[PDB]
């Protein structure tokens, strides 16, 4: 409730600049963070070659292909020698990485007095992951307004994202499918997840509307110690099932765009082997039209599930929401399940 | 190739990272370019207040609302005085454009009440017109266009195509122009504004990934034009009876080319007609070898200067080459000076 100020084109021009300066800040903040990751691995590489010279080990042949904390892969070649010397030179190799355990793969191919022993070292992963999902559209036809994806990023972590958006058929998929495709590439870079969401949230800021773009739900399970990073930027609830318990995780923040200041909060939970992480969109959680308490209804539905296969769990919950109606589907429905259990190699 | 590249996921993610550093590079360069203009507007502002002070009227309460080379608008307060001569030097220190007067003398009394406002001057009036059509002749077309004015200095016109189908391409075309409508509005170098759009739209590292673009910028200062073409989409200029075609060798939007986009400049005068079309109109007539010579004879047959009629009478004539069929999305934009 102010004056007129009808010469407002300049006020819009300089305001759009701050939108372009704001996103340029998170891009520069992303550039210095990835450069910091380049300097750590480079410093780790220098520290590794000095440690070899000092310890009584032979530098007959060496090749370093890549050195990420998740995907550790280096190759060496040393004289044949004898006994457990191929692995007791690895004890300092674990300590030089300071964080990761290293295993040995020794390929000795020289049935002659001359020494030709080629060896490769790789990272170790714990907790094997099993996946499965169920998909459904509002009209049950062709393409749904909800999009999901779940891919593994090397050895360390398994990712799972779900995006919603608008309710229209074509108007919501092209906007929801693009979010996951943009997230599927930014998460592949190996950047901090809390920063990766601000970077996606900044790029997708368009028109300065309310609830502009695709809401999203990201869950990343670290295989190092079976920890999870619950990132909710779509305000969609998620659940964890351990035997017969059902623990609900939720977070306060608004959809993707520039709807909130001071970005997105992270939520962490600790799980063990045999646990079941199920996620759904708003079409399943608010699916049944004749239900008041959607939290108790979703908890009791899982306690009746008597299986550990993640594929069946996604379907028995999906069709149970359909059972509450006369086969009706009043909204786009999507559910993703992930199970955790050790490798036991 | 080389080895069997077992753990390519490491080599494939370092490449995706470098793609994301490239767009982060032009974004930091975009920030330094607008900061350069913000330091230019600030350095000129300090240059203004000392020149305004040295005068028998004193600065009093001068108000500078905004000072970009396109929209110059400032207000001052001066004594009643009598017989605008303070604006001829005010135009010289800014070193560009021209300034007009707008001084209204309120209170016809020997008081010192007198408000004044100064604004930029624009030359060469623009006239617009376009024609729209869908692939199946339906409601949803794969081509999207827009033509808005950015203050006083320039009139813009963009056309994007993309895929052939109506649904898969309507989102990619509508998104390109909406993203272009915000990057051009910020006020930045046109050559750098294109590398900003193309870097953001780099996704999946495919061939001919996203929407091809056709940008035409008409400067109202001296009637110069900046032809920016991403996708080798031809355009034409009509002056009386001449038909000049502009083209560029660069490839569609994405990261399909290195060393960014070449800029093309042209000089036009009054009465000229800038027409633009997508690949659905230029390749409209299917039983034609030379699409350029065919399009040239069609414009010499156009006998009107109304930009709206030119867009329809050219589009409807492309339909006549077929049996009323529309084999692809069609879009044409006409601009007169």
Residue numbers in the entry:
A (entry chain A): 465 to 809
B (entry chain B): 465 to 547, 551 to 804
Paper excerpt:
Using bioinformatic analysis, we devised a construct (SpoIIE457–827) that included the C-terminal half of the regulatory domain and the PP2C phosphatase domain (information on the design of the construct is presented in the Materials and methods). The five molecules of SpoIIE457-827 in the asymmetric unit were paired in similar dimers; two dimers were formed within the asymmetric unit and the fifth molecule dimerized across a crystallographic two-fold axis. Comparison of the SpoIIE590–827 structures with SpoIIE457–827 revealed that dimerization rotated the switch helices (α1 and α2 of the PP2C fold, corresponding to SpoIIE residues 630–678) approximately 45° as a rigid body relative to the phosphatase core. In the dimeric SpoIIE457–827 structure and in contrast to the SpoIIE590–827 structure, the loop connecting the switch helices to G629 was ordered and overlaid well with M2-containing structures of closely related phosphatases such as B. subtilis RsbX, M. tuberculosis Rv1364c, and S. thermophilus Sthe_0969.
We investigated the PP2C family member SpoIIE, which controls the activation of the cell-specific transcription factor σF during the developmental process of sporulation in the bacterium Bacillus subtilis. SpoIIE is the most upstream member of a three-protein pathway that activates σF in the small cell. Like other PP2C family phosphatases, the catalytic center of SpoIIE uses two divalent cations (manganese in the case of SpoIIE) to deprotonate a water molecule that serves as the nucleophile for dephosphorylation.
